Design a protein around this ligand. Structure first.
Ligand SMILES: *[C@@H]1O[C@H](CO)[C@@H](O[C@@H]2O[C@H](CO)[C@@H](O)[C@H](O)[C@H]2NC(C)=O)[C@H](O)[C@H]1NC(C)=O
Ligand SMILES: *[C@@H]1O[C@H](CO)[C@@H](O)[C@H](O)[C@H]1NC(C)=O
Ligand SMILES: *[C@@H]1O[C@H](CO)[C@@H](O)[C@H](O)[C@H]1NC(C)=O
Lengths: 309, 192, 143
């Protein structure tokens, strides 16, 4: 069935955004098409430039607390020239009047390719997790030691990540099954009938006059019937599978009081407030629908086998 | 598990009839004769057989390990599973391996609201406040509040998904379909 | 009358992830019908996965709880995305698409609302069976 896509319910133009300078011609998806017919990937949402009518007096102040960064974030207490990379390679440490006091004296190697990138944007309707939606390099104060791992090396745990375990868990499972079915039936039927008949009558008369008569008759018949019936059926089924997961590490992102990246904050700053489903659906695909509060770095493998007879 | 049943039926019937009639009359000479003979036999036969074999097999295996460096730990894992040759050096390496990266085995528990620092700003009120929270937390969401599975399937909770572990002899989700299955037999004559 | 019929069905599936691409798929080739489990490949797989890991278990949390507080319009945008995340999961899914035949599990891969048909059945739309059925004609041949 060539099922078409009834995918054009249009809505009314909403009010223009003064600060964002965008319109919200809305739409909605109704029918996909279950068969080989016309594929329709038409995304929901529409934008348009509009002349702003409101003065746009509302603005984001620079936190009114301390030195503003070059992107919009703020120093809490010690984001000065103390080896704390938050904004850029030399953005925060641009002005260094005092001596470059190191925040930590011990040799602690940076988290290389490990759970450092703890942000993930998995889509429940989509696929495997996405990249990090927030900044995971900034740290608040004194380095928190991570003296664990396979070898003898010290890693760093960012202030955004609340925990980082190095448990090398490992497990596996296997299963098997066998089904068997057999049925046989034999039938045999035989019929036999035999028929024979005789008829003899003789006549003689002699009271010259003489008379002689003799009748003879025979009959032979048999009908043999034979019937044979046989039936046989066999069925077999096998089901077996195995799965294994080699766990490497585990982390738990801090829920509240966490720092974000300049790219995501700019998206939230340049974001509408009149329920723009079009941009929100567009913004939803960029950073996923929901992030991961706790993950498990590692890898798993699985094997599945089926058989039917 | 195995099941076998056999049934054999045989039926045979024979029945025949015999009749002989002969009449001769004599009476000047007159001769009258008569001869009637009847023969009829009947045979009936019937046969039936029943042969049904059924067998079921179930096997399950599971294992787990943790601790030590990843090299020595899983070298023990590969050789323990169906290896049948326990080595002397791998267990000694496992001893030095676990010394570097250990993990919990036995854990004695204690509530967090007892760990709050005393003589703080509002320590006591926050202490009992988290006490109400920790009591509500364990009683807010759990298997107790979810729905019960079928066929005694142990219900678990893994981040919203309230799945139930179904037994070995039974099939997967919702424990609805059995997958024992059941054998069907039709002795009807084939149409074509 | 002599009629014999036999049917056979076999299916196999496997997957793997993590570790460097050299050691990972070296494990893949030897596991599939290899029947000879090596000692060095699993040890190499141990060091391989240490370099490039991947998610196994993932605890989930909504995004609208991650929005920074005390922003310009944080609260109104928070509940606004809350209405969006609720509508998003309920806007397009298998629930709104059409149901397949013969209990075929329906999936959704970027618009294509295909349905996975069982093993004993044939492909798309689960219409044709492909069991097929045996036909017998005892008629005398014309020529
Ligand atoms: C039903 O019939 C099967 C026929 O396969 C029996 O299995 C044996 O089969 C061999 C070869 O076909 C015969 O030589 C044996 O005589 C059969 N065994 C017996 C005991 O007759 C099977 O045993 C029969 N009964 C059941 C319950 O399956
Ligand atoms: C005639 O009679 C004989 C003897 O009783 C019998 O065996 C036979 O079946 C009868 N019918 C014939 C010969 O057709
Ligand atoms: C019935 O007739 C068939 C035909 O030849 C013969 O083979 C068989 O022996 C006969 N049976 C009896 C009981 O006369």
């Amino acid at each position: 069935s060539h099922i078409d896509c009834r995918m054009s319910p249009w809505s009314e133009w909403s009010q223009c955004d003064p600060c964002l300078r965008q319109m919200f011609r809305s739409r909605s998806i109704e029918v996909f098409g279950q068969f080989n017919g016309k594929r329709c990937t038409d995304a929901v949402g529409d934008r348009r430039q509009c002349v702003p009518t409101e003065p746009c007096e509302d603005a984001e102040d620079d936190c009114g607390n301390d030195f503003q960064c070059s992107t919009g974030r703020c120093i809490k207490m010690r984001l000065r020239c103390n080896g704390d990379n938050d904004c850029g390679d030399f953005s925060d440490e641009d002005d260094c009047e005092s001596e470059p006091r190191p925040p930590c004296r011990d040799r602690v190697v940076e988290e290389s390719e490990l759970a450092r990138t703890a942000g993930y944007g998995i889509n429940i309707l989509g696929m495997d997790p996405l990249s990090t939606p927030f900044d995971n390099e900034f740290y608040n104060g004194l380095c928190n030691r991570d003296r664990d791992g396979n070898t003898l090396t010290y890693y760093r745990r960012p202030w955004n990540v609340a925990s980082l375990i190095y448990e090398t868990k490992g497990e596996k499972n296997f299963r098997t099954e066998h089904y068997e079915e057999q049925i046989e039936a034999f039938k045999s039927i035989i019929q036999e009938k035999t028929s024979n008949f005789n008829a003899a009558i003789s006549l003689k008369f002699t009271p010259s006059l003489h008379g002689k008569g003799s009748f003879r008759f025979s009959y032979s018949k048999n009908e043999t019937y034979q019937l044979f019936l046989s039936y046989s059926s066999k069925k077999e089924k096998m089901f077996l599978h195995v799965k294994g997961e080699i766990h490497l590490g585990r982390f738990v992102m801090r829920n509240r009081d966490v720092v974000l990246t300049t790219t995501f904050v700019d998206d939230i700053k340049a974001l509408p407030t009149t329920y723009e489903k079009g941009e929100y659906f567009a913004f939803l695909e960029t950073y996923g629908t929901h992030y991961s509060s706790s993950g498990s770095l590692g890898g798993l493998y699985e094997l599945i086998y089926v058989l039917d007879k | 598990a195995s099941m076998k049943r056999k049934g054999v039926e045989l039926k045979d019937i024979k029945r025949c009839l015999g009749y002989h009639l002969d009449v001769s009359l004599a009476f000047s000479e007159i001769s009258v004769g008569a001869e009637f003979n009847k023969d009829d036999c009947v045979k009936r036969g019937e046969g039936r057989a029943v042969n049904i074999t059924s067998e079921n097999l179930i096997d399950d295996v599971v294992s787990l390990i943790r601790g030590g460096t990843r090299k020595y730990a899983f070298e023990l894992k590969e050789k323990l599973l169906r290896g049948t040759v326990i080595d002397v050096t791998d267990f000694v390496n496992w001893a030095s391996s676990i010394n570097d990266a250990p993990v919990l085995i036995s854990q004695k528990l204690s509530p967090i609201y007892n760990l709050v620092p005393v003589k703080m700003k509002n320590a006591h009120l926050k202490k009992q406040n988290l006490e109400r929270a920790i009591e509500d937390y364990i009683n807010e969401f759990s298997v107790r509040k979810c729905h019960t599975c079928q066929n005694g399937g142990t219900v678990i909770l893994m981040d919203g998904k309230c799945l139930c572990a179904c037994p070995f002899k039974f099939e997967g989700i919702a424990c609805e379909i059995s997958k024992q299955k059941i054998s069907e037999g039709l002795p009807a004559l084939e149409f074509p």
